[PDB]
Amino acid sequence: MIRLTDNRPIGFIDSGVGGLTVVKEALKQLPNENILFVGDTARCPYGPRPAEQVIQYTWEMTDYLVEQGIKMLVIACNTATAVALEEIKAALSIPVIGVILPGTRAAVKKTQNKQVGIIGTIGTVKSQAYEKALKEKVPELTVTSLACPKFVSVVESNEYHSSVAKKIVAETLAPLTTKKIDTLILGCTHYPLLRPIIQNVMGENVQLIDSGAETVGEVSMLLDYFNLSNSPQNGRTLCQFYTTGSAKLFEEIAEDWLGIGHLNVEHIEL
Amino acid sequence: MIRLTDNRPIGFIDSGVGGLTVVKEALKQLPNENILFVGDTARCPYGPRPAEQVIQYTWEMTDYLVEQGIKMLVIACNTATAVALEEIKAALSIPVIGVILPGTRAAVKKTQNKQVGIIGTIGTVKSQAYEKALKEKVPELTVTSLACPKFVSVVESNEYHSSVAKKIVAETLAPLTTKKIDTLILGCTHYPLLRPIIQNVMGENVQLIDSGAETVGEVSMLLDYFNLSNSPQNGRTLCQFYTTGSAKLFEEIAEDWLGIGHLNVEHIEL
C-alpha cells in the first residue's frame, strides 16, 4: 500500500577502517541509499578494551550519527556488535543491525558437509561468538575457528595484494586446508581485501562468506519491512565519512579500498 | 549476546488453500519452527470482495491466531496482503509479513535484461501491485503482467499435473513467451503447484520467482532480527491447520500438496 520515500542516510559505525568493506557492499547493493560512516580510529582498537569502554564509545558514535539524521544503524565491526548491539537496538527507535548473525545465517545455508570454518582476530575467535551462533542453529556442525593475527595489519597497511600478504595468509591458513571445510566465514571486516588470496589458499571448492555483504543483504530486507527505502528518483546523493583520527590516513585508505572517486572525509571529535 | 529460545508457533493466515505453498516452504526452510495455519475457505474468495470485508475477515483470522499464541504473523495471500498488511502490522506487537514485497525484491535481484513478468489472478494483476512495487525499485524495468483466469481452478481441483493443466497453462502463457522475459513472478500462492508446467512452457532461461518461498526467506531473517527463533533442540513439535470451511476438503488438499504424513486439520468458526 503506502510506500514512503525516506532519503535520510543509513548509518555505519566502526572502531576503525574495517567497516569500509561493509560500506563498499552497501554502495553496490543499495545504489539509491545515502550513507554516513564513522570510524573511531582515535580509540581503535576496541578489542583489548573493557566492555564498558566499548559500549560507551559505541554509544558516542551512535548518538553522533542519529543527530546527523540516520534512519537505520549498522554496527560494522565484530567487537561493537558483540558488546553493544542489543543494548543500542533496544534503546533506539530506528533499526539496528550487527555483523555476526547475517554471516552465520549465510554459512548455515551454504554448507553442504557441515564442516564450517571461521577466521578473524584472536579476540573474535576467543569470544566464540561465531561458534555459538552457528551451533545454536545447527548443532551437528563441525566448526573450526582460526585466529589470523597479522591479517588486519596487512590490510590496514594497504599491502593486501603484496608478497608479504600471500605469505602471511598461506602460512596462517595452512592448518585449515586439511579439514574438509566447504564454507569459511570471513569473521573480520578487514578480510574482504584479502579475499583473492584466501580463496586461492583455500581452494575453489570452499565457499567464502563475507559477513558484511550478508549484513547489507539483511539491510535491504529491513528497508522494505520498515518502509524506510529511498527512491530511485532521488538516488544516492550523500556519502559522508567521519573519523576521530587522522582524516588523511583515512581518506587514503578509504579511496584505495572503495576504489572509486574522491571521498568526503571529515575529522570529528566524540 | 542473549539469544532467546521461543517455541511459540509462526502464524499463517489465508483466504483459502493457496497459502499452503507458503507453509510448505516454511516447513522446508524453517525445520525447527512450529506452525499454525488458518484458511477462511467458508468466505473464500476475498478478491471480488470490498476492502472493508477483507480487512474484517483478515482481522478475525489474525485475532484467532494471536489468541492461539503466535509470535509472528505471515499473511500468505496477495489479496489480504494488499488490503490488510499495513493496518495489522501497525496495530500488532508481533512482526507481520506479506507476500508481495519479498517476491518483488527477489525478481529485481534475479533479472538480467530488466524484462520482468508476473502472473496471478485478474484481481492481483488489475491491482497493479507488483508492477508498482517493481518499478518503485527499478523504474527501467519492462514489466509484463498477465492474468491466468483458470490456474487457481486447476490447482484447487488437484489437477495441476493433468493434461487439462498443461493445455490451460500452455495457452494462457503463450503471449508471454515472446517478450524476452528472463524473470517471471508467480504472483499467486496457488501457482507453485503448476511450476513444472510453467517452467517448461516458459523455457529454461526464465527464472521463476516463488513469492511465498521468498517471503519465508524474509521470515528467517526476521526471526534473528527480533530474537524470536525456536531452538533445534526443541525442533518443530507443532503444525496445526484451521479452516472455517470443510475440514475434509482441506485435509484432502493439504496432504496432497504438502506430500507428507497425516496433517492436523480442524474446522473452526470466526
Report residue A199 as a C-alpha cell: 580463496
Domain count for chain B? 2
Examine the domain organization and report whether A126 and A160 are in the same domain: yes
Report residue A233 as a C-alpha cell: 528518483
Among A184, A211, A238, residue at a domain's last position: A211
Q: Is A1 on the interface with B (CB under 8 A)?
A: yes
Examine the domain organization and report whether A134 and A265 are in the same domain: no
The CA radius of gyration of chain A, in Å to the nearest whole number, is 18
The CA radius of gyration of chain B, in Å to the nearest whole number, is 18
Among B179, B211, B243, residue at a domain's last position: B211
Is B221 within 8 Å of A138 when comparing Cβ atoms? Answer: no
Of the residues B44, B77, B148, B239, only one is catalytic, namely B77
Q: Is B8 on the interface with A (CB under 8 A)?
A: no
CB proximity under 8 Å: B 224-243 to A: 224-225, 229, 231-233
3-state secondary structure of A8: coil
Examine the domain organization and report whether B129 and B220 are in the same domain: no
C-alpha pair distances (Å), B201 with each of A76, B147, B169, B198, B212: 45, 16, 8, 5, 21
Examine the domain organization and report whether B94 and B216 are in the same domain: yes
Examine the domain organization and report whether B91 and B221 are in the same domain: yes
Nearest one of B61, B121, B70, B125 to B93, comparing CA atoms: B70
User: B164 and B154 in contact (C-beta within 8 Å)?
Assistant: yes
CA distance B190 to chain A (A): 22
Nearest one of B81, B218, B195 to B148, comparing CA atoms: B195
Is A82 within 8 Å of B2 when comparing Cβ atoms? Answer: no
C-alpha pair distances (Å), A24 with each of A4, A131, A255: 25, 26, 11
CA distance B136 to chain A (A): 7
Q: Is B137 on the interface with A (CB under 8 A)?
A: yes
Instruction: For residue A137, give the nearest of B86, B105, B232 by CB distance.
Output: B232
Which residues of chain A make contact with B220, given a CB cutoff of 8 A?
Answer: 105
Report residue B231 as a C-alpha cell: 531452538
Q: Is B82 on the interface with A (CB under 8 A)?
A: yes
CB proximity under 8 Å: B 16-35 to A: none
C-alpha pair distances (Å), A230 with each of A7, A194, A235, B34, B153: 5, 32, 7, 35, 39
Binding residues of B for substrate: 14-15, 46-47, 78-79, 189-190
| Sign of the CA dihedral with A214 first, then A216, A221, and A225 last | positive
Q: Is B136 on the interface with A (CB under 8 A)?
A: yes
Q: What is the spatial distance between Cα B223 and Cα A256, in angstroms, rounded to a whole number?
A: 37
| C-alpha B81, offset from chain centre | 10
Cell 537496538 sits on residue: A89
Contacts of A21 (CB under 8 A, 6+ apart): A189, A190, A191, A192, A193, A210, A212, A257
B129: CATH: 3.40.50.1860
Examine the domain organization and report whether B89 and B125 are in the same domain: no
Examine the domain organization and report whether B149 and B51 are in the same domain: no
Print the domain residue range for B189: 99-211
Instruction: For residue B101, give the nearest of A101, A102, A224 by CB distance.
Output: A224
Cell 523504474 sits on residue: B139
The CA angle B137-A35-A262, to the nearest 5 degrees, is: 110
Among A196, A211, A226, residue at a domain's last position: A211
Examine the domain organization and report whether A223 and A133 are in the same domain: no
Q: What is the spatial distance between Cα A150 and Cα A159, in angstroms, rounded to a whole number?
A: 12
CA distance B220 to chain A (A): 9
Catalytic residues of A: 77, 188
Report residue A220 as a C-alpha cell: 535491504
Examine the domain organization and report whether A58 and A144 are in the same domain: no
Examine the domain organization and report whether A112 and A205 are in the same domain: yes
CA distance B63 to chain A (A): 21
Examine the domain organization and report whether A195 and A258 are in the same domain: no
Examine the domain organization and report whether A117 and A131 are in the same domain: yes
Q: Is A114 on the interface with B (CB under 8 A)?
A: no
Contacts of A73 (CB under 8 A, 6+ apart): A10, A11, A12, A13, A62, A65, A66, A88, A92, A94, A95, A96, A97
Q: What is the spatial distance between Cα A254 and Cα A264, in angstroms, rounded to a whole number?
A: 10
Q: What is the spatial distance between Cα B47 and Cα A82, in angstroms, rounded to a whole number?
A: 47
- Give strand pairing partners of B210: B186
Is B232 within 8 Å of A138 when comparing Cβ atoms? Answer: yes
Question: How many C-beta neighbours within 10 Å does residue A155 have?
Answer: 24
Cis upstream peptide for A196 (omega within 30°): no
Q: What is the spatial distance between Cα A176 and Cα A156, in angstroms, rounded to a whole number?
A: 24
Q: Is A14 annotated as a binding residue?
A: yes
Which residues of chain A make contact with B107, given a CB cutoff of 8 A?
Answer: none
Contacts of B200 (CB under 8 A, 6+ apart): none
User: A129 and A77 in contact (C-beta within 8 Å)?
Assistant: no
Q: What is the spatial distance between Cα B51 and Cα B47, in angstroms, rounded to a whole number?
A: 9
Is A232 within 8 Å of B82 when comparing Cβ atoms? Answer: no
Resolution of this entry, Å: 2.0
